[PDB]
Amino acid sequence: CSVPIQCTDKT
Amino acid sequence: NTGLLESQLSRHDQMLSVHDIRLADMDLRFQVLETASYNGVLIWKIRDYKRRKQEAVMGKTLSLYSQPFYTGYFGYKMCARVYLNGDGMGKGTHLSLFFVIMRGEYDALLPWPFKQKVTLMLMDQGSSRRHLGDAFKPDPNSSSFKKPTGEMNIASGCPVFVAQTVLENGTYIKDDTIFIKVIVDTSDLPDP
Numbered sequence A: 001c002s003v004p005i006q007c008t009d010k011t
Numbered sequence B: 001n002t003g004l005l006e007s008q009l010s011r012h013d014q015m016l017s018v019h020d021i022r023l024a025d026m027d028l029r030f031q032v033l034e035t036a037s038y039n040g041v042l043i044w045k046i047r048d049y050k051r052r053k054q055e056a057v058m059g060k061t062l063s064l065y066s067q068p069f070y071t072g073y074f075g076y077k078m079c080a081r082v083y084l085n086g087d088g089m090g091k092g093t094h095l096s097l098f099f100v101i102m103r104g105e106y107d108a109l110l111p112w113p114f115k116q117k118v119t120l121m122l123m124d125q126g127s128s129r130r131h132l133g134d135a136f137k138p139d140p141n142s143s144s145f146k147k148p149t150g151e152m153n154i155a156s157g158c159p160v161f162v163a164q165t166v167l168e169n170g171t172y173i174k175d176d177t178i179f180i181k182v183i184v185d186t187s188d189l190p191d192p
Helices: B004-034 B049-058 B164-168
Strands: B041-047 B077-083 B094-102 B120-122 B157-163 B177-183
Touching: B041 B049, B041 B077, B077 B177, B094 B120, B094 B164, B120 B157, B157 B164
Parallel strands: none
Antiparallel strands: B041 B177, B077 B094, B094 B157, B120 B177
16 A cells, blocks of 8 residues: 555644 | 622632643543553544544544554654544545654654654454554655644545445444554664
């Protein structure tokens, strides 16, 4: 897998 | 004075309200340590699934974070975050979980960006012990592993760790509670 992804938060 | 005493009684309640509030925090502060680990490993015991997930859909509480845990008495302050219903690429379909780096009172002596190997995994409470999980060697160029500026760096994981379906229908949910585990590598990083 690898290939690290992020989330939806920065308000 | 049936008016002066009045002030005093209130000055006490006000302050009283306060201790209660502090004593409150302290009541929690403990729990953290009580359950903190200094070897780069973690076991997040999330109790009350049914309810807590449900909240995840109604969108009242989309995610919860773990207890900050590190990798050596004075190493990286880090912790996990989970989205029961899912975030972005897996919302409504899967469960999402990420590794996060916090601003740590000792980040000033630690290497940056963070490079240690993670390893996320949802434990299996069934007897078949087939736990699930993936790992990665943190890509450096990302804003997720820099030297923390604010409270905690940007999250990072796999929005599609496991399918809500596969999850809820496997031997992991038990007594309305489950255990996520994180494993940061610490060998390829000499200590003090």
